[PDB]
Scaffold this active site. Structure first.
Site, PDB file in Angstrom:
ATOM      1  N   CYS A 111      29.596 -79.779   4.308  1.00 37.37           N
ATOM      2  CA  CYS A 111      30.249 -79.263   5.514  1.00 37.37           C
ATOM      3  C   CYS A 111      31.769 -79.152   5.422  1.00 37.37           C
ATOM      4  CB  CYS A 111      29.907 -80.141   6.733  1.00 37.37           C
ATOM      5  SG  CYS A 111      30.740 -79.601   8.224  1.00 37.37           S
ATOM      6  N   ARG A 114      34.519 -80.851   8.681  1.00 39.08           N
ATOM      7  CA  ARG A 114      34.528 -82.271   9.030  1.00 39.08           C
ATOM      8  C   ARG A 114      35.843 -82.860   9.549  1.00 39.08           C
ATOM      9  NH1 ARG A 114      32.262 -84.857   3.711  1.00 39.08           N
ATOM     10  NH2 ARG A 114      32.784 -82.815   2.768  1.00 39.08           N
ATOM     11  N   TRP A 283      30.998 -74.858  15.573  1.00 36.20           N
ATOM     12  CA  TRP A 283      31.356 -73.452  15.708  1.00 36.20           C
ATOM     13  C   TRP A 283      31.392 -72.697  14.356  1.00 36.20           C
ATOM     14  CZ3 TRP A 283      34.874 -77.166  17.742  1.00 36.20           C
ATOM     15  CH2 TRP A 283      36.018 -77.392  16.961  1.00 36.20           C
ATOM     16  N   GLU A 288      30.277 -66.811   7.443  1.00 38.37           N
ATOM     17  CA  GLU A 288      28.868 -67.146   7.567  1.00 38.37           C
ATOM     18  C   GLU A 288      28.105 -65.911   8.035  1.00 38.37           C
ATOM     19  OE1 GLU A 288      27.802 -71.308   9.117  1.00 38.37           O
ATOM     20  OE2 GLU A 288      29.882 -71.119   9.802  1.00 38.37           O
TER      21      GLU A 288
HETATM   22  C1  HEM Z   1      32.681 -77.930  14.558  1.00 44.82           C
HETATM   23  C2  HEM Z   1      32.740 -76.849  13.768  1.00 44.82           C
HETATM   24  C3  HEM Z   1      32.038 -76.786  12.394  1.00 44.82           C
HETATM   25  C4  HEM Z   1      32.348 -75.903  11.450  1.00 44.82           C
HETATM   26  C5  HEM Z   1      33.450 -74.831  11.538  1.00 44.82           C
HETATM   27  C6  HEM Z   1      31.486 -76.137  10.318  1.00 44.82           C
HETATM   28  C7  HEM Z   1      31.495 -75.432   9.143  1.00 44.82           C
HETATM   29  C8  HEM Z   1      30.385 -75.399   8.342  1.00 44.82           C
HETATM   30  C9  HEM Z   1      30.009 -74.341   7.437  1.00 44.82           C
HETATM   31  C10 HEM Z   1      30.819 -73.047   7.211  1.00 44.82           C
HETATM   32  C11 HEM Z   1      28.860 -74.701   6.860  1.00 44.82           C
HETATM   33  C12 HEM Z   1      28.042 -73.899   5.841  1.00 44.82           C
HETATM   34  C13 HEM Z   1      26.748 -73.486   6.558  1.00 44.82           C
HETATM   35  C14 HEM Z   1      25.931 -72.528   5.730  1.00 44.82           C
HETATM   36  O1  HEM Z   1      26.477 -71.976   4.719  1.00 44.82           O
HETATM   37  O2  HEM Z   1      24.730 -72.320   6.083  1.00 44.82           O
HETATM   38  C15 HEM Z   1      28.470 -75.995   7.378  1.00 44.82           C
HETATM   39  C16 HEM Z   1      27.348 -76.695   7.018  1.00 44.82           C
HETATM   40  C17 HEM Z   1      26.931 -77.911   7.475  1.00 44.82           C
HETATM   41  N1  HEM Z   1      27.498 -78.623   8.528  1.00 44.82           N
HETATM   42 FE1  HEM Z   1      29.277 -78.116   9.382  1.00 44.82          FE
HETATM   43  N2  HEM Z   1      30.635 -77.192  10.613  1.00 44.82           N
HETATM   44  C18 HEM Z   1      30.937 -77.605  11.909  1.00 44.82           C
HETATM   45  C19 HEM Z   1      30.311 -78.622  12.603  1.00 44.82           C
HETATM   46  C20 HEM Z   1      29.317 -79.456  12.138  1.00 44.82           C
HETATM   47  C21 HEM Z   1      28.662 -80.518  12.892  1.00 44.82           C
HETATM   48  C22 HEM Z   1      28.964 -80.839  14.382  1.00 44.82           C
HETATM   49  C23 HEM Z   1      27.762 -81.100  12.075  1.00 44.82           C
HETATM   50  C24 HEM Z   1      26.798 -82.279  12.308  1.00 44.82           C
HETATM   51  C25 HEM Z   1      27.021 -83.224  13.231  1.00 44.82           C
HETATM   52  C26 HEM Z   1      27.847 -80.435  10.788  1.00 44.82           C
HETATM   53  C27 HEM Z   1      27.113 -80.746   9.676  1.00 44.82           C
HETATM   54  C28 HEM Z   1      26.824 -79.823   8.705  1.00 44.82           C
HETATM   55  C29 HEM Z   1      25.769 -79.944   7.732  1.00 44.82           C
HETATM   56  C30 HEM Z   1      24.773 -81.111   7.575  1.00 44.82           C
HETATM   57  C31 HEM Z   1      25.835 -78.660   6.902  1.00 44.82           C
HETATM   58  C32 HEM Z   1      24.925 -78.248   5.712  1.00 44.82           C
HETATM   59  C33 HEM Z   1      23.612 -77.789   6.344  1.00 44.82           C
HETATM   60  C34 HEM Z   1      22.634 -77.211   5.360  1.00 44.82           C
HETATM   61  O3  HEM Z   1      22.324 -77.913   4.360  1.00 44.82           O
HETATM   62  O4  HEM Z   1      22.156 -76.059   5.599  1.00 44.82           O
HETATM   63  N3  HEM Z   1      28.789 -79.437  10.861  1.00 44.82           N
HETATM   64  N4  HEM Z   1      29.424 -76.393   8.284  1.00 44.82           N
HETATM   65  C1  LIG Z   2      19.946 -72.555   4.908  1.00 46.67           C
HETATM   66  N1  LIG Z   2      20.535 -71.208   4.796  1.00 46.67           N
HETATM   67  C2  LIG Z   2      20.258 -70.470   6.041  1.00 46.67           C
HETATM   68  C3  LIG Z   2      21.401 -70.591   7.053  1.00 46.67           C
HETATM   69  C4  LIG Z   2      21.090 -69.704   8.251  1.00 46.67           C
HETATM   70  C5  LIG Z   2      21.861 -70.031   9.520  1.00 46.67           C
HETATM   71  C6  LIG Z   2      21.654 -69.191  10.611  1.00 46.67           C
HETATM   72  N2  LIG Z   2      22.286 -69.389  11.770  1.00 46.67           N
HETATM   73  C7  LIG Z   2      23.135 -70.405  11.914  1.00 46.67           C
HETATM   74  C8  LIG Z   2      23.393 -71.288  10.865  1.00 46.67           C
HETATM   75  C9  LIG Z   2      24.377 -72.402  11.159  1.00 46.67           C
HETATM   76  C10 LIG Z   2      25.038 -73.090   9.977  1.00 46.67           C
HETATM   77  C11 LIG Z   2      26.119 -73.902  10.649  1.00 46.67           C
HETATM   78  C12 LIG Z   2      25.840 -75.108  11.285  1.00 46.67           C
HETATM   79  C13 LIG Z   2      26.875 -75.796  11.911  1.00 46.67           C
HETATM   80  C14 LIG Z   2      26.611 -77.115  12.597  1.00 46.67           C
HETATM   81  C15 LIG Z   2      28.162 -75.267  11.893  1.00 46.67           C
HETATM   82  C16 LIG Z   2      28.390 -74.055  11.255  1.00 46.67           C
HETATM   83  N3  LIG Z   2      29.621 -73.487  11.218  1.00 46.67           N
HETATM   84  N4  LIG Z   2      27.367 -73.415  10.670  1.00 46.67           N
HETATM   85  C17 LIG Z   2      22.741 -71.113   9.644  1.00 46.67           C
END
Ligand code: HEM
Ligand SMILES: CNCCCc1cncc(CCc2cc(C)cc(N)n2)c1
Ligand code: HEM
Ligand SMILES: CNCCCc1cncc(CCc2cc(C)cc(N)n2)c1
Ligand SMILES: C[C@H](O)[C@H](O)[C@H]1CNc2nc(N)[nH]c(=O)c2N1
Ligand SMILES: C[C@H](O)[C@H](O)[C@H]1CNc2nc(N)[nH]c(=O)c2N1
Ligand SMILES: [Zn+2]
Lengths: 413, 409
Positions: A111, A114, A283, A288
């Protein structure tokens, strides 16, 4: 393992020193002989397994509140230990649950967002008993998190796993996704990635509008029962239509996206307790949507259609016509979200904030686990600071883990 | 175990068996992955088993494992190590070893080409003047008037670490870098120190933006000596744009031959500390890294200016827009000048085909995703969505200490 490990930034020359990796609890999948760093994904705990895992977490909590070795700390340990012995499990206090969620996010190596880790609204849904209740809790999550465009990050935590036959599960991988419909001719309508799941919903009784952007219903499983369908109230689903600040023809592509990114398929692990249904949201980073959702070949795949309307030479790849349309689509995505006052962050801002977060984490916590392969944005990689940042990846607990898709494991009653 | 890798775009699965053949660490453990660390951390008794393993895979690859030819060669390597604490490779073995070190280079996206490599054996070299002659021949052969050809020149193997052959230049051709009085930097800032070692050795700098650095060559552990490559051997390209007539006025050029000279080639437990190798450029190397890296030529802001972009918020993606145009110009310039170059789309496609080739005939292909994915437009190339297993096979190209941090003058 060595005590201190160094990571270097090749752009700025900054060397950082990591001690946190010593607290590593799970396996990465790598060995001395092989590296699985680019691999996407590389009946319950017994009383004797649970004891050490619980204590580990509890000690850590009391450490964070500067009460380690205190009376309250030892009393809490004895209370948990007696509870695991009498009931094979234990229950987290609310303070402990809130700490755990925040730390699972803090520890999420994949992520990039963070820097906001400690600002997370945690909704305790552990009193939930039915799918209708799950739905009520989720609608409340969505409305709170959405906040009329000013998004706020949140997690809703449903009851923990007991014997494994009574799981709570959100079958949707994300709370808000678009449907996908396979045609007899082999083409796809909607988001091609969701065809399998769209088919599951239809089977369970959903009436498909069969359009390009149909918000899927929730498929909700309470207490190990068959899942039930609910339609999220349309007015709770904030959506942004995609337009371009220069090209007037871009709105004619009829594209839009949802404002709230919310992951609902992962497992929250705190003190050895397993929270199999724990939807969380934050958000969006623009890429993405603009790079992946829109431009992946297995997704909406709009590069070809956009390149045409741009009047680009599309014969040789060395014109880089693909690249040039990618930038414009991502400009249009960031432009449409800012104009509608929906919270979005670009990949420059987000990566820069993440470097600062990582550094502060090294300064205060002794490390910050990060998966470079996920952290680097899927476009313009080397012109963001993270590209040049060396990272150590490892798995601290509490954490968000992957888990099997529920349709593969559910025993239909 | 038989390991599997999935491409998430196409859903193709490949099965890696080849990884079982490796014995060198990668740097990771079960609990820590160092997949993004750039540089993760011999005698008769050490030298033989390695010699044996390499001789064995050589005779296996030519379909005579356990032949009379094979058996004598092993006895041959026995006596030679026993009495000289080392041994010398047959020509055919040297060529195989070099080709396979390229083949095993995880970080290289160009490996579809691995078996077409011209190997120059320079093991009879004794002096820096010698090395310089060998290198000029390399550069001239490989440049080939624009129709580039892969080549490698291999100097004498290490003996006692005190008499090392070393090219001090990290690459055969690079521009100079000048620390200005006012604090700015002229030329390529990456080279500032090396440039200054050259000036300290007698090099008369023209203090320009694109000054080809001289060669600094160390033969047999001796002090190094300076040599300027004759200009007509150094092919360069003026960068212009197909639609932006002002782009030529920027004043940009790059050299045509990418040629890495700071690495160590290891074969059979032998250490070729001087083994410059070259191929041909992928466009992003220059357009993204060389020109747009903040600690390199850093031209993004200048270009964006001439493009009249709105540069007040990062969210206008002005940087992204400028970058795409810079790389279009680069490809267009080389192409227009009949100089071999490959775009990151073409090259990545080739690499995926190469991977499929490898899994089918060899049972795997070590690849470093962090290095294979281009530094721009990552997920719109196929390798983004390709799971890759990284592991270390031998013969290999390894990293070595910079010579100026070890040499006793
Ligand atoms: C608040 C704004 C946040 C932003 C801008 C952000 C940004 C991102 C981005 C760009 C990704 C890549 C997602 C993808 O490529 O599918 C990601 C993944 C992830 N985020 Fe964050 N995130 C945010 C909040 C959070 C929160 C609130 C949580 C959990 C409490 C979190 C936990 C995770 C986890 C576990 C992944 C990897 C998920 C997976 O394996 O598909 N994120 N985040
Ligand atoms: C596992 N690969 C498929 C991802 C598809 C997909 C479709 N809609 C929303 C998300 C959200 C991923 C995501 C999650 C959180 C918490 C924050 C953030 N910026 N982005 C992912
Ligand atoms: C023939 C066309 C070739 C192409 C298109 C190509 C492409 C590339 C690219 C883009 C890189 C990344 C370099 C960087 O970013 O610093 C690279 C690295 C590398 N290549 Fe290739 N290459 C080619 C030939 C060769 C040859 C002939 C050899 C050896 C005989 C070789 C061995 C390597 C090695 C060892 C690296 C990693 C260098 C390092 O660790 O810094 N390549 N290649
Ligand atoms: C180590 N990171 C900085 C590298 C800078 C640098 C400057 N000039 C030439 C190269 C050579 C890179 C290179 C090497 C080979 C063999 C092929 C190819 N296409 N490209 C590298
Ligand atoms: C094969 C590879 O691991 C896969 O395509 C990864 C690469 N990096 C990624 N990075 C992010 N943020 N999201 C992803 O889905 C992926 N996919
Ligand atoms: C920190 C990271 O290892 C470093 O920035 C790497 C990333 N990927 C790369 N990829 C290539 N091809 N060349 C590089 O120099 C780098 N640098
Ligand atoms: Zn690893």
């Amino acid at each position: 393992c060595p005590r201190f490990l160094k990571v270097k930034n090749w752009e700025t020359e900054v060397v950082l020193t990591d001690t946190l990796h010593l607290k590593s609890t799970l396996e990465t999948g790598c060995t001395e002989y092989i590296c699985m760093g680019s691999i996407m994904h590389p009946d319950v705990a017994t009383k004797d397994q649970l004891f050490p895992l619980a204590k580990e977490f509890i000690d850590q909590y009391y450490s964070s509140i500067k009460r380690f070795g205190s009376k309250a700390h030892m009393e809490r340990l004895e209370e948990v230990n007696k509870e695991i012995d009498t009931t094979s499990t234990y229950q987290l206090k609310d303070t402990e649950l809130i700490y755990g969620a925040k730390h699972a996010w803090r520890n999420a190596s994949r992520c990039v967002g963070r820097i906001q880790w400690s600002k997370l609204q945690v909704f305790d849904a552990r009193d939930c008993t039915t799918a209708h209740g799950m739905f009520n809790y989720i609608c409340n999550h969505v409305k709170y998190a959405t906040n009329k465009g000013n998004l706020r990050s949140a997690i809703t935590i449903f009851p923990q796993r007991t014997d494994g036959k009574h799981d709570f599960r959100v079958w949707n991988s994300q709370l808000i996704r678009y449907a996908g419909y396979k045609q007899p001719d082999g083409s796809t309508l909607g988001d091609p990635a969701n065809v399998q799941f769209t088919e599951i919903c239809i089977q369970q009784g959903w009436k498909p509008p069969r359009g390009r952007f149909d918000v899927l219903p929730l498929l909700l499983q309470a207490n190990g029962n068959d899942p039930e369908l609910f339609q999220i109230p349309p007015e709770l689903v904030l959506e942004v239509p995609i337009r371009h600040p220069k090209f007037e023809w871009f709105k004619d592509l009829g594209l839009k996206w949802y404002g709230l990114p919310a992951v609902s398929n992962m497992l929250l692990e705190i003190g050895g307790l397993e929270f199999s249904a724990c939807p969380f949201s934050g958000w969006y980073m623009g890429t993405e949507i603009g790079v992946r959702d829109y431009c992946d070949n297995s997704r909406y795949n709009i590069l070809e259609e956009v390149a045409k309307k741009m009047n680009l030479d599309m014969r040789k790849t060395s014109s880089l016509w693909k690249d040039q349309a990618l930038v414009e689509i991502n400009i249009a995505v960031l432009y449409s979200f800012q104009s509608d006052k929906v919270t979005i962050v670009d990949h420059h801002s987000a990566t820069e904030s993440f470097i600062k977060h990582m550094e502060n984490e090294y300064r205060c916590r002794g490390g910050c686990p990060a998966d470079w392969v996920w952290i680097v944005p899927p476009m313009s990689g080397s012109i963001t600071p993270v590209f040049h940042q060396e990272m150590l990846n490892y798995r601290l607990t509490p954490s968000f883990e992957y888990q099997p898709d529920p349709w593969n494991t559910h025993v239909w009653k």
